[PDB]
Design a protein around this nucleic acid. Structure first.
Lengths: 95, 97, 83, 75, 109, 97, 83, 95, 109
DNA sequence: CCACTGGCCACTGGAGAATCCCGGTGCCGAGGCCGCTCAATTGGTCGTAGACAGCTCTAGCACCGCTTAAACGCACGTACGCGCTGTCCCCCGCGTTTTAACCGCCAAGGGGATTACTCCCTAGTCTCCAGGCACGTGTCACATATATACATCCTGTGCATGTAAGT
DNA sequence: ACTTACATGCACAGGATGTATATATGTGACACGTGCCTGGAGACTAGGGAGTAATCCCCTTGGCGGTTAAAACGCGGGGGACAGCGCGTACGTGCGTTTAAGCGGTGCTAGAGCTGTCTACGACCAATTGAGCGGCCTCGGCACCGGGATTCTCCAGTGGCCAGTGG
């Protein structure tokens, strides 16, 4: 028996099942999606951590996260992401 | 007969002058006016460190001047000495802009 | 207090001087307008990043070090301003 | 219909008597000003000028073929 | 007497694991403390971004009449949205090829 | 009479084909021969994942094909359709190398 | 064991295929050698970094992860091989 | 009352004097130098942190430091930097 | 009772503060742990690079017949070295200007 | 002088060919189930990071008054893009010969990967002191100004040369 | 076919200008001394990540036969690169003018920034599970193959048009 390799396959698989219940996925393109998610996560956490250093903050909070989103992601995509993230934060605020 | 230099001779003289120079070519006051104007577009009542506008000044002028030697490369590659805009959006698009 | 035509502030011989530091000896009359467009677009990019830093800093006065962050976030690193 | 273009070319070179021969662009503008469908007859005017050179009735000043300057003969 | 455990993704109504994201943030050495809502916000914006890129990929596949997403569909989707394109301008795609582009000057008369 | 297309027509058909296609255009085994040749120039007895070789191959051809549209824009910039290496050196210099 | 000339293994039809995917109509013969030089120079630029990762991992076998780290170090990020 | 701000003015001043006793400096040139020091420091630090990330390393040792110096520094600058750092490690090992 | 405090920069025989850069590495959040010789090695390579650029700047200022270096000298030093230029191709110097550089095709005759 | 005739150009239809499109067909990745396990979750706690208020002071914003430097603008010229043509040769393309790439099949073993183990080093804490930083001060490298000296660029002008008119 | 007069080109002298260069002078920014305090060193410890040894197995390397598709070579031809000639125009350069930037000075204050507080929040840790990952089986989407339709290319045939030429 070998070591578990953590993957993003099942979650994005569920996501594609809401947005396209009909279609399929190729596994290497699925790995492309995993690399995409890991890469943009690495970026966004990068400027988030740097910004937390710049304002001398010990804790990574969602305010600099949305700052980082509109730092990287352009325009209407940024404000859309702001909308869904904001409503999700309110939902988790209401638990 | 009044003195007059031929075309280019002057132009290369200030080419040498502004290459040995390090100093500012734009008047700073319309630059701060323009910066305040365009910053008003994103957010109202903005205040400005003078050094911040200075850093904007060299950053902008360096960006555009780098585009100018790139435009020189484009024009001489097209065997010309006179530039056209198509040089500039060519250089930007190869830069990915 | 309102400003409307400050893109005309980059004067015509100033653009010529900028070309001379770029080493161009001959420039067309059709160059100034798209150079104005390129420089402005670059400026809204950098000031947008800087102001995003600024309301993250929760200030209404922008600082040079935030400008340093805004320029380096696309890799246009400038020295001599607290960086 | 109208007259053939050869004497039109001779009138084009005869209009000016510049000290050098008339250029191809100047004679094209001359046939444009006098009135001729110059756009579809570029081959026609080029063969006419080359023929008129080859007879020796016209002598080409500087260029070769259709290029350069074209002047009248000695007599 | 412990209550039934949900997941933070379920509490936020999201698909990506908030717990795994939070663990990766903690072990990613970005700050020694992590706010509670920040990985929730991050998972939400991630789910959004994957949603539009998957939707464009599915539209490309439907246009290419294949029921399975291939990397060529990914390339054709990602290059045709200019904001996402210059977002990934320095990003190279596996087996994507290029957009079909010929210059009109290269085209014959 | 044997058939023959006019020049460029067949060529444009391979632009259509290869822009339609997605696969690698070079033979993999001479490529990995080159890879092991260059790797030996750094340190001996280096061993390779095949996927690593494929990643090197696709990244290499991606950088090259990017240089190819750069060269195409350079050539049509000089009002030409045939490329000469000066286009490629200009493309490298605007790209920053 | 040793290798002396594999850069000529980048065949003329392969270069032409890359040109066709680049959309090139007409190609001079002098494109070929400089193209080989540019591509190989890119190759040691990336593979030096990748091998430095590999003995950094204390390995004598080069993995795709080292390749990925080296390439996105040079701002040439590739998907499809990470993970 | 003021707060202390940290910079490299004394150290770079010592370095410039021991390479050139006769040579001065302007203050904003020192600002350029401080920006240089912080820039290459953050480059090498982010690279070393990512090296520790890739090898799953908890502790930043000099091996990944010299690895990243070899990685980033072009040409003979890398070899000289490795030599100088090795010498400094040698004396600090003896001290 | 205790040994007199001796500086680690002197232990490496260096000018840059080992303790300061160690503190910066610890509080820069790059890892939770750091070896002792790594900031020593970093201080050495930093001191080497500063020595190189200061030598080049002093040579430039001497060629400029100036006792005190200026960022024009820094620009001239940083761009006339190919390795330093590849180090800082994306880095701009405030009031450094550019290299005196004209194309020969732009020259008369 | 006119009509007969020959060269040149544009249009067009037909033939060929390459590709798009329709079925069939076997096949192997996709996907879905299952079994395990380990990491998210629950819950509680404790320390502490940042929010919040409140004072301070400083630098930026605003206004104005001179004060040139520079922008603008006009005007005239000449140098340059550029369009056309002519010419040459270089490379697309297509056929023929070659060859090595690839598949696939098998052998072998080399090193990455995984687990255990024990220990070398380093985060952490306490104490103490000293070196760097804010700040004051002074002082000479250099900016600025002015007077010479040379470089250089442009243009008249005398001499050399090819070509038209007279003999 | 020769000799003589005239347009053209070219090298040089000189002058006008711009740029360097020498010298005097203030000045303020660089450099250097000072108090200090906080951040770096000293010493000890907990413990834990990490070096190292053992194993295994799997993934990489080497080799061997066949095949063919891809590569190499040759011919050739046309079309594209490029040189040159002319031509118009559109900036380069110079001078007058406007004006606007800029420098100096003054007043305001609002907000940047420091400081105390405290508390909401988040790290740390024992329990536990179910969500998620490794492995396995199946199948149907899909790659590949084969046949016809379609659409695109090209070129030979034909009509129109102009000019030479002979009756």
């Amino acid at each position: 028996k070998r070591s578990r390799k953590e993957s993003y396959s099942v979650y994005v698989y569920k996501v594609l099942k809401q947005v396209h219940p009909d279609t399929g996925i190729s596994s290497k393109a699925m790995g492309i999606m995993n690399s995409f998610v890991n890469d943009i996560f690495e970026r966004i956490a990068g400027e988030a951590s740097r910004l937390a250093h710049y304002n001398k903050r010990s804790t990574i909070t969602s305010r600099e996260i949305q700052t980082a989103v509109r730092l990287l992601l352009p325009g209407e995509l940024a404000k859309h992401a702001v909308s869904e993230g904001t409503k999700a934060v309110t939902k988790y605020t209401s638990a | 007969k009044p003195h007059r230099y031929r075309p280019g001779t002057v132009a290369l003289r200030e080419i040498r002058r502004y290459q040995k120079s390090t100093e500012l070519l734009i008047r700073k006051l319309p630059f701060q006016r323009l910066v305040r104007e365009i910053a008003q577009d994103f957010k109202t009542d903005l205040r400005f460190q003078s050094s911040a506008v200075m850093a904007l000044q060299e950053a902008s002028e360096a960006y555009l001047v780098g585009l100018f030697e790139d435009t020189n490369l484009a024009a001489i590659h097209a065997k010309r000495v006179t530039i056209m805009p198509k040089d500039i959006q060519l250089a930007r698009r190869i830069r990915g802009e | 207090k309102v400003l409307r035509d400050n893109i005309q502030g980059i004067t015509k011989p100033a653009i010529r001087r900028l070309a001379r530091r770029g080493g161009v000896k001959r420039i067309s009359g059709l160059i100034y307008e798209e150079t104005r467009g390129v420089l402005k677009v670059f400026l809204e990019n950098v000031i947008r990043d800087a102001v995003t830093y600024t309301e993250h800093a929760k200030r209404k006065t922008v600082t040079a070090m935030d400008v340093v962050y805004a320029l380096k976030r696309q890799g246009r690193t400038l020295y001599g301003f607290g960086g | 219909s109208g007259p053939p273009v050869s004497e039109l070319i001779t009138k084009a070179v005869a209009a000016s008597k510049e000290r050098s021969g008339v250029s191809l662009a100047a004679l094209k503008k001359a046939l444009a000003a006098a009135g001729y469908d110059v756009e579809k007859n570029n081959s026609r005017i080029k063969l006419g000028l080359k023929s008129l050179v080859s007879k020796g009735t016209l002598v080409q000043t500087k260029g070769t073929g259709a290029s350069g300057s074209f002047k009248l003969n000695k007599k | 007497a412990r209550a039934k455990a949900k997941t933070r993704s379920s509490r936020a109504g999201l698909q990506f694991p908030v717990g795994r994201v939070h663990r990766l943030l903690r072990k990613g050495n970005y700050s020694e403390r992590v706010g509670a809502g920040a990985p929730v916000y991050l998972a939400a914006v991630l789910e959004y971004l994957t949603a539009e890129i998957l939707e464009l990929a599915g539209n490309a596949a439907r246009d290419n009449k294949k029921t399975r997403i291939i990397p060529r569909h990914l390339q054709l989707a990602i290059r045709n949205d200019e904001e996402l394109n210059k977002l990934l301008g320095r990003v190279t795609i596996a087996q994507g090829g290029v957009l079909p582009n010929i210059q009109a000057v290269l085209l014959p008369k």
